[PDB]
Ligand SMILES: Nc1ncnc2c1ncn2[C@@H]1O[C@H](COP(=O)(O)OP(=O)(O)OP(=O)(O)O)[C@@H](O)[C@H]1O
């Protein structure tokens with residue numbers, strides 16, 4: 001009954017929110033400042049205390065020391081180089097050569113060492129964050145999961161069963177098969193379960209414009225890999241980062257090959273990465289260079305093939321568990337109808353077969369809806385199918 | 395004529411380049427050789443004129 | 445001012461009375477709460493006093509710097525525009541949140557300390573690739589197809605407008621949609637109808653301009669493309685004529701086909717990254733569906749494959765009815781003669797004959813279009 005009475009008394013208090021929130025001070029929307037009620041404790045003290053005693057302390061780079069005396073040699077970004085000194089607040093220990101240090105503008109002396117340069121495009125491919133794919137969702141390839149998982153996490157979760165036995169566990173592993181087989185999806189489960197630094201690399205990101213520019217990204221990558229205690233490096237589509245050296249006449253594709261050779265040298269030869277585990281993934285493994293195929297770099301060579309029957313039925317149980325269906329259907333008939341198929345194709349049959357129930361007006365799909373999915377996805381889209389020339393990997 | 399020997403002792407004036415203006419009587423100006431600066435305006439200059 | 449998200453009672457019930465009158469209670473309490481400050485605080489004004497105090501901290505020569513790292517105890521290494529970089533400190537009115545590596549900041553002139561951050565005026569390439577307004581008329585302009593229209597609404601529009609069906613079904617929408625057929629049959633036209641229809645942010649890029657002249661600039665362009673497409677919201681990415689990356693070779697490409705290949709590798713990632721993709725829809729179109737790599741065509745990267753056939757004559761006459769709608773058609777003409785003139789004419793051919801016949805009318809300053817306009821018009825369009 002109080003139709004306007006709740007309206008205007010609602011509205012003058014919804015406006016009267018703003019009518020005193022202007023009296024608070026939230027207004028004068030900025031160009032990059034902050035709210036007025038926050039920093040109010042750097043108001044009289046740190047305004048004259050983080051400013052008036054506090055310096056600028058320009059950062060530099062050390063060339064070298066010399067004996068018997070401090071007498072360091074500095075280097076800066078563009079300007080000249082100097083003979084410089086410590087402060088009293090620093091020990092002469094951690095002023096090792098090739099280091100960035102903070103330096104005052106007047107006496108030009110050293111205040112604090114700095115962390116080295118990281119080239120933060122390498123920092124961009126640190127994953128920082130984990131996907132949600134469970135090893136439950138990678139059904140059909142259980143022994144591949146186990147044979148991978150014993151290489152990936154068992155020394156990391158238990159570095160005693162390998163020590164007390166007296167073996168060094170293998171460090172390198174690649175994954176390969178036809179496309180859509182569950183390789184990338186299988187890697188997402190590893191990034192789900194693990195805990196160390198998972199630094200992903202997609203191989204096409206390393207193609208640079210300059211000469212040898214990608215190799216420095218490799219070097220910085222393995223440096224910040226060496227900074228951590230244990231680390232996991234992921235590789236994807238490494239056919240782009242190198243197939244093989246073949247060169248003749250006009251030198252083509254050389255810039256990729258120098259990057260691939262730098263990857264070889266960072267994997268083996270003169271002091272091993274130590275506690276760094278790598279993981280590759282490709283579509284066609286035939287093109288890859290045999291020195292890259294050497295163990296000590298690529299110890300495990302997990303195959304991903306098509307599921308026989310039972311892996312397929314298990315995949316139907318995975319992609320079909322979470323949808324409203326007719327109860328008394330069978331999946332075994334469908335796995336009889338899909339001899340050569342991927343889990344992507346099985347998933348597309350499920351996600352299409354729901355849409356067949358969405359076609360007319362129902363809520364739960366049927367066996368004949370599945371039959372409408374099978375001939376369409378398999379046999380109507382069978383013109384392309386993407387698989388057979390990748391079975392031979394050509 | 396006498397005033398100029400005093401007035402010519404003043405330092406020069408920079409040339410700049412307005413990118414675009416923003417809030418509270420300020421603009422964004424980048425000199426060719428140097429970097430972009432956030433400066434204010436003088437009172438005899440209008441924002442829409444900028 | 446984003447006060448409360450629970451808006452669900454929807455009616456003249458009393459969760460609204462108690463709850464809207466509850467924030468109303470705390471706004472009577474808020475108004476008379478702040479009222480004692482302007483009542484009995486004559487010490488400082490604080491609406492501009494401390495604001496002018498901050499503006500007296502920061503100097504007028506506000507230099508613009510660049511971020512490259514952050515150390516948490518309000519000091520970091522920032523780069524000047526010259527290149528020489530410092531280790532200045534960060535103020536407390538700088539609300540450390542919009543600080544990413546590569547961000548534009550405001551420094552002191554004297555000690556170069558981090559005063560403020562700067563809003564970015566954005567890259568022009570986003571405005572280059574972003575479609576602004578609705579292109580043209582709706583699906584009623586199309587005519588004749590009527591099946592794949594249901595397919596495209598099925599994969600794109602109905603997921604947007606009705607996100608209830610897929611949840612009562614327990615299913616996700618189909619991901620990838622590709623279009624193919626003979627040329628000039630309406631592939632771009634249907635995409636214009638979708639760009640009319642949707643509310644998502646719409647992106648269009650020709651497949652020819654994917655290729656570059658420098659090494660890796662292609663895949664970098666792809667990465668920043670899907671960056672732009674992701675960083676908005678529920679969007680739609682359209683690509684036309686993606687066979688042209690494989691058909692023609694150009695001399696501007698310093699790399700060979702083994703750079704085009706690597707571009708297709710990075711794109712082949714970006715359809716199916718291991719990362720959480722998000723609400724990005726992809727619509728693709730070509731006329732040479734057989735040329736390209738089927739690894740890009742597999743389900744998972746492209747789900748729905750839609751062929752566009754040549755028009756049957758019944759549909760052709762409908763297209764004549766569309767493109768001769770608002771023109772002053774003289775009664776001399778017979779459209780059924782104009783149907784079977786070419787056995788395999790496209791939908792563009794009809795519009796070409798109609799527009800060129802109108803040009804033949806405007807040669808003679810008339811208002812209606814006669815039969816011989818069409819008679820020499822089909823000779824002008826078809827035969828050369
Ligand atoms: N064993 C499986 N169980 C469940 N789903 C699977 C399985 N194998 C593949 N899939 C489905 O196939 C899709 C493709 O997975 P993934 O990206 O790992 O393919 P891939 O083997 O890496 O080939 P590509 O390199 O072409 O991506 C996934 O979305 C996943 O849903």
Ligand SMILES: Nc1ncnc2c1ncn2[C@@H]1O[C@H](COP(=O)(O)OP(=O)(O)OP(=O)(O)O)[C@@H](O)[C@H]1O
Pocket residue numbers: 585586587588589626627628629630631632633634731763766790791792793795
């Ligand atoms: N079924 C149709 N009804 C009405 N007009 C049509 C039809 N098909 C094509 N057209 C006309 O043909 C013109 C070209 O359409 P469009 O470019 O979409 O075809 P296309 O197959 O995308 O061409 P291309 O193969 O060159 O990309 C459009 O402006 C449209 O008006």
Ligand SMILES: [Mg+2]
Pocket residue numbers: 180183184185
């Ligand atoms: Mg993959």
Ligand SMILES: [Mg+2]
Pocket residue numbers: 628630631632633
């Ligand atoms: Mg077209």
